Amino acid sequence: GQLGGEEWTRHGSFVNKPTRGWLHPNDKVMGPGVSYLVRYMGCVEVLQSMRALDFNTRTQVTREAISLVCEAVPGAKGATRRRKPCSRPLSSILGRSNLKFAGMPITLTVSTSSLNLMAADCKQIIANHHMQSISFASGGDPDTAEYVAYVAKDPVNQRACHILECPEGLAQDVISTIGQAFELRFKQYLR
Incomplete structure (x- = not known):
């Protein structure tokens, strides 16, 4: 079945030009991939869009x-505990975060x-x-003392936002600061 393949990796590099992607180079993602121990935190259901x-x-x-996901699962202990809603941010944003995993x-x-x-x-x-995998993050400065958040398009057009927590290693890339695995601008499929 199928005609032709592309699961090989014995070709040369680019013509002769440097570059920087996730963590450091681009090959680091297209070959070895950045892997470390990161605590996957529940997602946060957002409603915001225009009137913000x-x-x-x-x-x-x-x-x-972030404080939401923690509310449901205080086991991590970072901002709140047990149960205790707080004010802010301003305007009618966010709806509820699920501790699912x-x-x-x-x-x-x-x-x-x-x-x-x-x-x-x-x-x-x-x-x-x-x-x-990704597209638009929050960045933060900081995001929340020592917390990290991820975006999740589903439905598409900014809907859900996953949560994460890394003490060191990937926290540098996820937080967004040093390079970033490019090759994707609302076109996908390298089209």
């Missing part, structure tokens, strides 16, 4: 979001337009086939 703070709600939202320490791996996780505590591998 002021043509922006990255920090604001992500702030209450929160505070779970596993070995995550980031690849060029492909994120594959590996249950380090559950003793198995975690897969994901919803979309490429």
